[PDB]
């Protein structure tokens, strides 16, 4: 079943791979973040709520980084799964490119991480399992993240993850060199200006559990040159309320040596998803969001921003 | 200590060891000082081995289905361990080779042995690198597994104690601190020396093999007539190995029970004094030491005869095996020394290797089974952790400890910024109440909600080693003005002043250099300084006078931290009108909830969210006549001893008359000389000790260590109170455990082998020599080398054993004092603080215990170094000499050497009963410690410029007092919280150094001996001692009274209903320091004990601390109706209490003044006046 709907899907997204401002409004910004801001829109002609993404040209090109937009465009165009938000429309404007995507309401998860502190295994294990579906997802396409943080995970009414931010993303077969990423969340090898390939995700997820379970990332300190000598040291001190079971899947997760890393060595998604940490998570029924979540966010209409700042 | 060689050493000098040298050279002069020890390696530290380990036990849980603790071990060491092994294997082959070459060396002494003196210049060659192959191969391989074993040693202690910190309160009472000290104690030195033995049990059938190949060369078949009487002996080992560890395993029950008991009544040593129990306590441990006694002794005397099967076997496998071959054939007196060349080695392979070795395996895999299951059981489940609840809901709440549930139908809720006082008679439930709201006590029904975040004031204080700013901040931050707010605002400023060093005052464990009060008030302040939530504030109001009291609820409570939602437990109808909501429970369900009225019908902001290093300040504090004392101390012992001499001397004088005077053995003159060398060889059957010379001394060395503990006990109980706070309670635990653990089990047996070896040398040289005094001469350059080498060794040995002794009290300590604050370390959170201490303990225990092995190696290899030179040295000099005729030269000098063979392991044994005897030196300074110092008819007592210190040369707390009782008047002693109140009624008991004079009755105190002086003072101490034992023993510990006048007396107190809710009328058994009475019946049971106890005079100190007045009013009764015509002293912080006394004695700034009226009193000090509550104000005043 999931072998022969992996296959469908690496099937249709090469026939969209290879086929790639006057009807919005200014209600609000929803956080505007680098180059551009993205701004609150309101479809004249349905009533749908829309969210409005711009980017700067001239920042685009001072920036050295515009093969990310163009890839991060198309990407988002041939891209269709559950847990990641869908572009609609895609606008090319004298002074700014703008990308219209479908409106979250509940806002960021960071802002909820924040306010209540910490949460419970279960309360983690929820959204780790649909993370971990969304990389395998990706990974079977060919396709790298590369920037997951906590800050670019919305979340929908029913309270399921949904993805955002697409722009260092890369469509890649083999090994890359070029480094970019938030320092908490870099992997060893992309620190040490080597190749590197899909394992980094890996990497990204065990740090985003481990900072969920605990409130604050592991590998922190002042000045970025301290947390990259933190990060290649690869030295880690648990908080005691960690059970052994998810302690044993972050020291799997999180080792240094890429050879084996979690996620890498010979099953590619088996060695996680069959996992103790895993044994009361049923993959068929939440993928087809058949599972209560245990977190609802309170939305007071398609209009209601009071989640975000 | 900096810098360890080790890492930085070259390899050709780490082969050798020639890195320890300095710290011989410093300290071979003059004391060894702390600036000679050396950092410990990094590859050693605590920190990064622990987690190595569970690195791999948490992959274990997370993988098996059926997890084994052996197999993170093995996942960690195996490869190590088996790199050693292999080398150690080639260390034992090499030695079984020896016998080919040196038996044709000594057979080239033979003018007819035509072939083999021709060649024997290349056999003397090739034995000469054989020793320098044997010698190398065999130390580094043996410190390797030492340093092993230590490593698997530390990991799984911090294992351990990682797991201590977050047990469930269920399983606590079936842990006491006796098991774990046990647990700990039993495996601390044997473990890791014990490894090397280990490798034993797959060498020794692969050497027998070899040795039976060889002997098979020169017997044919009827060699394997040793082979079976070897394999019966080994299966009777077997059987004795058996039966000695089910005795042990028996055993191992009491121990716990007495250590315990040994802890609580070491600790409570002020409440023994006062009672004048230090004789029922001796006779409490005794009855517990007569049935281990009575187990370890019957286990020594099969560990005797599993050790005895060595020597005796030596002639019998020889001649069982060599008979039949002489008895069809003539033999060559060469083949039996040949015979016996093969047999020592032999014997030594079977009889005392493998056994060993399975012992070894036995215990070790015991040990580790029982970690294995000390790992799983329950453990406490965090509380939800949410930023954003401000409210505490607790709806539909019952629970139950394991019949009357203790809560039932229990439900309230309060918002952000409330105060709910809570309110109840003794025993209803209010402590337990906090302890459901904690999740200590997890409820049966109903739910609690609340944000997780609570700081915790407990009932009990808990003070902890250290400064009085260390322990309010409590390892946080520091900052500079929330420090000074806290300490201001609980009056404990003027506290402070007094102390010499100020804020910087060294805080024993337990705070007993402080008074009750200053202890609850550093509680209070700790519990203040923790930003939190919800505040749980358990009756800090109990040891407070009313204006102290009054002032820290109207400035702390209610004005500093009025943002906060604190919960309040107290019992004053002054607090309950400040609060907006009252909960009043009684015999466990609610009895009303609602606000007060109904009854009658930015200092604290906010706040955001160690080395595991021996700098130089940790390692400061561990900074022949002795055999003499112990031999003497026992007067059979010498007797014994005489008559081993005696034996001894006969069987020399049997064997050299045998000896001198002297078919089926060829024997000629030119081949006579291998007598000699075979009487030699088998010598170790013939001067041994059978068990009529072996059991009586076995049974006498365990008889003296029962004298030694008996002795020592009885002295700690008689020391001066100023001394007993010299000591640690880690001091006093490890002195009781394992210096008497090692007198009973370890040092007779290696006394006895001791012994053994040096009676076979000293017998082997006697003979031999006179028959031809040459052997003698020969043999001094070896003798006096082996002496010279051994004192200038132990010259430092001896100072690195102590300081390794002393390293392993700082983790007794930290493990005692860890158990007491369990509740409060899981209330603030501060599990990682006490994890770096206790592993920054470790270290400093393996800093010390690292350089004694190494020296340890150091030498065992410089004597078998000399003993190869001399070797060689001495063998190319015998085989030049042979030139072509009666080599006579080398026919006494190889014989010099045999001697030498076993001169050696005896000087080896020498070192070990040494480093043992330093557990007899530590005992014998506890012993040596100096010593403390009808008739009361009526009671008047005067006292005359009476002075008291704590300290002599130290600050006086109190002079110049002339007050004077009368007899039969009650006097009210008052004061403030601190002033020398309680060190008033205790100078009458002479526990401090005081200076005066004291006229009751009118016999001076000082005419009267202190334990008949101290007899007539009957006490209740403001530190309530309850220890482990029935409710019969702790009422009475003489059985003085039986069973009518104790229910008679019981009843009175109120504690009828209090014993007989339990299985065990009058018998149930109390545990953990009583702990399952509440806090309020300990002072009844202090009171039925002071009632029983009919003295003339009464010194109660507090005896209301806790009760509210519903219940205080027994205490008014009794006082009024069982002693009514007994004068007492009645120190008291109630007001209604100082209603019925007729002289009063208040204490203010270091002196005394009297008042014969309360009325008076009053009128001279109007901020206390203004203080007291109204209803006592209209009670005093018509
Ligand atoms: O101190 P006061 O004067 O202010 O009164 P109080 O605070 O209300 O007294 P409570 O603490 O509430 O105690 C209320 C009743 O519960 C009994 N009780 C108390 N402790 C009990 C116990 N202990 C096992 C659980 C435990 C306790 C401490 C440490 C480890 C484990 N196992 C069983 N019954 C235990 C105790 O005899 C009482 O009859
Ligand atoms: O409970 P309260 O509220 O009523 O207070 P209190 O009754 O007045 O208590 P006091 O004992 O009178 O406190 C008086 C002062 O003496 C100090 N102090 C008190 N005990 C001290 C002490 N004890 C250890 C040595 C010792 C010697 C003999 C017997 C017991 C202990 N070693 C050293 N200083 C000790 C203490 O700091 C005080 O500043
Ligand atoms: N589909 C959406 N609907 C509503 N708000 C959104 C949506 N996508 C993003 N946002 C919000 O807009 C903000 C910025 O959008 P984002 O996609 O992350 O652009 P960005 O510049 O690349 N972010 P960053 O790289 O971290 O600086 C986010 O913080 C979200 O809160
Ligand atoms: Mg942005
Ligand atoms: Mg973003
Ligand atoms: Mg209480
Ligand atoms: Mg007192």
Redesign the interface.
Same mark, same amino acid.
């Not at chain 1, 306010?115 to 910490?118: C, E, K, P």
């Given at each position: 079943s999931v072998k022969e709907f992996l296959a469908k899907a690496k099937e249709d997204f090469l026939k969209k791979w290879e086929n790639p401002l006057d009807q919005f409004e200014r209600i609000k910004t929803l956080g505007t973040g680098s180059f551009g801001r993205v701004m609150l829109v309101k479809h004249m002609e349905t009533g749908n709520h829309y969210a409005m993404k711009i980017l700067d040209k001239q920042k685009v090109v001072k920036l050295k980084q515009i093969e990310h937009t163009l890839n991060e465009k198309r990407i988002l165009q041939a891209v269709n799964f559950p847990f990641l938000v869908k572009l609609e429309f895609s606008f090319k404007d004298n002074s700014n490119l703008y990308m219209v995507m479908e409106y979250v309401p509940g806002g960021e998860m960071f802002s909820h991480l924040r306010?209540?502190?910490?949460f419970?295994e279960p309360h983690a294990r929820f959204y780790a399992a649909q993370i971990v579906l969304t990389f395998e997802y990706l990974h079977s396409l060919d396709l790298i993240y590369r920037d997951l943080k906590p800050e670019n995970l919305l979340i929908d009414q029913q309270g399921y993850i949904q993805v955002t931010d697409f722009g260092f993303a890369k469509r890649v077969k083999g090994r890359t060199w070029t480094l970019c990423g938030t320092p908490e969340y870099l992997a060893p090898e992309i620190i040490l200006s080597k190749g590197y390939n899909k394992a980094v995700d890996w990497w990204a997820l065990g740090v985003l559990i481990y900072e969920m379970a605990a409130?604050?990332p592991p590998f922190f300190a002042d000045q970025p040159i301290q947390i990259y000598e933190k990060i290649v040291s690869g030295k880690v001190?648990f908080?005691? &309320?960690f059970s052994? /079971?998810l302690? /044993?899947?972050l020291?799997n997760l999180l080792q240094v040596d890429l050879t084996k890393r979690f996620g890498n060595l010979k099953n590619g998604v088996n060695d996680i998803k069959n &996992?103790?940490w895993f044994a009361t998570t049923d993959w068929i029924a939440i993928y087809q969001r058949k599972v209560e979540a245990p977190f609802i966010p309170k939305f007071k209409g398609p209009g209601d921003t009071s989640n975000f700042d | 200590m900096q810098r360890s060689p080790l890492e930085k050493a070259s390899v050709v000098s780490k082969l050798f060891f020639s890195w320890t040298r300095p710290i011989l050279r410093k300290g071979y002069r003059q004391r060894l000082e702390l600036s000679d020890i050396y950092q410990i390696p990094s590859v050693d530290s605590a920190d990064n081995l622990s987690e190595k380990l569970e690195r791999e036990w948490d992959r274990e849980l997370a993988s098996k289905k059926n997890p084994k603790l052996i197999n993170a071990l093995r996942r960690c060491f195996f490869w190590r361990f088996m790199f050693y092994g292999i080398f150690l294997y080639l260390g034992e082959v090499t030695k079984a080779v020896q016998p080919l070459l040196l038996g044709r060396i000594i057979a080239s002494y033979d003018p007819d042995n035509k072939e083999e003196r021709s060649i024997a210049i290349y056999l003397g060659i090739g034995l000469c690198l054989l020793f320098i192959v044997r010698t190398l191969l065999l130390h580094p391989a043996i410190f390797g597994l030492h340093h092993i074993g230590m490593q698997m040693r530390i990991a799984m202690f911090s294992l351990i104690y990682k797991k201590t910190l977050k047990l469930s309160s269920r399983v606590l009472d079936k842990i006491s601190i006796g098991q774990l000290v046990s647990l700990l104690s039993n495996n601390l030195n044997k473990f890791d020396e014990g490894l090397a033995l280990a490798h034993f049990v797959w060498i020794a059938p692969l050497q027998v093999a070899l040795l039976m190949g060889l002997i098979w060369e020169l017997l044919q078949a009827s060699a394997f007539c040793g082979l079976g009487f070897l394999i019966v002996l080994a299966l009777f080992q077997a059987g004795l190995g058996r039966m000695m560890m089910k005795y042990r395993d028996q055993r191992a029950g009491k121990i716990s029970e007495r250590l315990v008991i040994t802890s609580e009544m070491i600790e409570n040593i002020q409440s023994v004094k006062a009672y004048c129990w230090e004789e029922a306590m001796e006779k409490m441990i005794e009855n517990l030491r007569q049935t281990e006694l009575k187990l370890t002794r019957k286990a020594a005397y099969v560990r005797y005869f599993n050790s005895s099967a060595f020597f005796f076997s030596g002639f019998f496998v020889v001649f069982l095996s060599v008979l039949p071959y002489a008895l069809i054939k003539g033999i060559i007196l060469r083949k039996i020394f040949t015979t016996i060349s093969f047999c020592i080695v032999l014997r030594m392979a079977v009889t005392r290797q493998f056994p060993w070795a399975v012992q070894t395996w036995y215990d070790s895999l015991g040990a580790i089974n029982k970690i294995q299951d000390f790992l799983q059981k329950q453990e406490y489940k965090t509380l939800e952790y949410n930023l954003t609840t401000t409210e505490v809901v607790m709806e539909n709440v019952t629970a139950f400890w394991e019949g009357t549930p203790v809560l039932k139908d229990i439900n309230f809720k309060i918002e952000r910024g409330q105060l709910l006082a809570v309110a109840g008679s003794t025993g209803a439930g209010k402590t337990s109440l906090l302890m459901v709201i904690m999740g200590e006590l997890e409820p049966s029904e109903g739910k609690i909600k609340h944000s997780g975040r609570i700081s915790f004031c407990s009932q009990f204080s808990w003070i902890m080693p250290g400064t009085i700013k260390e322990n309010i901040i409590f390892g946080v931050s520091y900052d500079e003005y929330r420090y000074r707010s806290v300490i201001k605002a609980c009056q404990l400023e003027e506290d402070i002043s007094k102390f010499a060093e100020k804020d910087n005052i060294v805080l024993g464990e337990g705070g007993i250099t402080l008074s009750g009060g200053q202890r609850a008030r550093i509680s209070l302040a700790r519990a203040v300084y923790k930003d939190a939530d919800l505040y749980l504030l358990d009756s800090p109001f109990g040891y407070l006078d009313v204006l102290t009291e009054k002032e820290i609820f109207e400035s702390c409570v209610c004005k500093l931290m009025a943002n906060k939602t604190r919960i309040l437990v107290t019992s004053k109808m002054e607090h309950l009108k400040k609060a907006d909501k009252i909960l009043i429970l009684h015999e466990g369900s609610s009895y009303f909830y609602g606000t007060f009225s109904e009854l009658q019908n930015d200092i604290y902001s906010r706040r955001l969210s160690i080395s595991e290093e021996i700098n130089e300040e940790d390692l400061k504090e561990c900074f022949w006549n002795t055999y003499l004392r112990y031999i003497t101390v026992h007067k059979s012992l010498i007797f014994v001893l005489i008559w081993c001499l005696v034996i001894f001397l006969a069987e020399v004088a049997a064997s050299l008359v045998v000896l001198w005077l002297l078919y089926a053995v060829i024997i000629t003159s030119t081949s006579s000389y291998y007598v000699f060398y075979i009487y030699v060889g088998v010598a170790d059957t013939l001067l041994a000790m059978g068990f009529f010379r072996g059991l009586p001394l076995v049974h006498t060395l365990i008889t003296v260590s029962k004298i030694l503990h008996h002795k020592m006990l009885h002295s700690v109980l008689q020391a001066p109170m100023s001394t007993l706070n010299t000591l640690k309670a880690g001091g006093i635990l490890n002195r009781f455990s394992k210096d008497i653990a090692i007198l009973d089990d370890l040092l007779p047996l290696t006394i006895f082998d001791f012994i053994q070896l040096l009676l076979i040398v000293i017998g082997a040289i006697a003979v031999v020599a006179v028959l031809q005094p040459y052997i003698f001469v020969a043999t001094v350059p070896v003798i006096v080398a082996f002496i010279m080498l051994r004192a200038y060794f132990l010259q430092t040995s001896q100072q690195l054993k102590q300081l390794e002794s002393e390293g392993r009290s700082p983790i007794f300590t930290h493990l005692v004092t860890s158990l007491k604050g369990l509740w409060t370390l899981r209330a603030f959170g501060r599990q990682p603080y006490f994890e770096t201490l206790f592993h920054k303990a470790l270290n400093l225990h393996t800093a010390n215990w690292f350089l004694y092995l190494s020296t340890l190696r150091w030498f065992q290899m410089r004597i078998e170094m000399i003993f190869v030179i001399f070797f060689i040295a001495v063998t190319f000099i015998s085989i030049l000499t042979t030139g072509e005729g009666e080599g006579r030269v080398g026919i006494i000098l190889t014989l010099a050497m045999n001697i030498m063979s076993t001169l050696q392991w005896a000087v080896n044994s020498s070192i070990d009963v040494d480093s043992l005897m330093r557990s007899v030196s530590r005992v014998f300074k506890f012993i040596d410690m100096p010593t403390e110092g009808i008739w009361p008819s009526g009671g008047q007592m005067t006292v005359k410029d009476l002075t008291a210190k704590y300290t002599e040369g130290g600050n006086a707390i109190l002079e110049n007092i002339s007050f004077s009782i009368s007899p039969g008047q009650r006097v009210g002693l008052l004061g403030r919280t601190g002033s020398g109140k309680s060190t008033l009624l205790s100078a009458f008991l002479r526990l401090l150094n005081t200076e005066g004079e004291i006229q009751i009755d009118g016999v001076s105190w000082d005419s009267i001996t202190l334990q008949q002086w101290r007899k007539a003072f009957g006490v209740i101490p403001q530190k309530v001692f309850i220890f482990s034992g029935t409710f019969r023993k702790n009422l009475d510990p003489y059985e003085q009274w039986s069973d009518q006048e104790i229910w008679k007396v019981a009843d009175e107190v109120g504690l009828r209903s209090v014993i007989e809710q339990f299985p065990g009328k009058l018998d149930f058994v109390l545990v953990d320091g009583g702990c399952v009475l509440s806090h309020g019946h300990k002072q009844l049971m202090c009171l039925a004990r002071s009632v029983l106890s009919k003295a003339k005079i009464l010194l109660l100190d507090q005896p209301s601390a806790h009760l509210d007045p519903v219940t205080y009013q027994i205490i008014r009764r009794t006082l009024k109706q069982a002693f009514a015509d007994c004068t007492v002293i009645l120190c008291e912080h109630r007001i209604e209490a100082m209603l019925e006394c007729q002289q009063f004695l208040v204490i203010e700034e270091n002196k005394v003044r009297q008042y014969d009226s309360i009325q008076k009193l009053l009128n001279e000090r109007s901020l206390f006046r203004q203080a007291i509550s109204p209803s006592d104000r209209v009670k005093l005043f018509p």
């Open positions: 306010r209540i502190g910490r419970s409130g604050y001190r908080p005691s &309320h052994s /079971d302690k /044993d899947l020291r &996992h103790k | -």
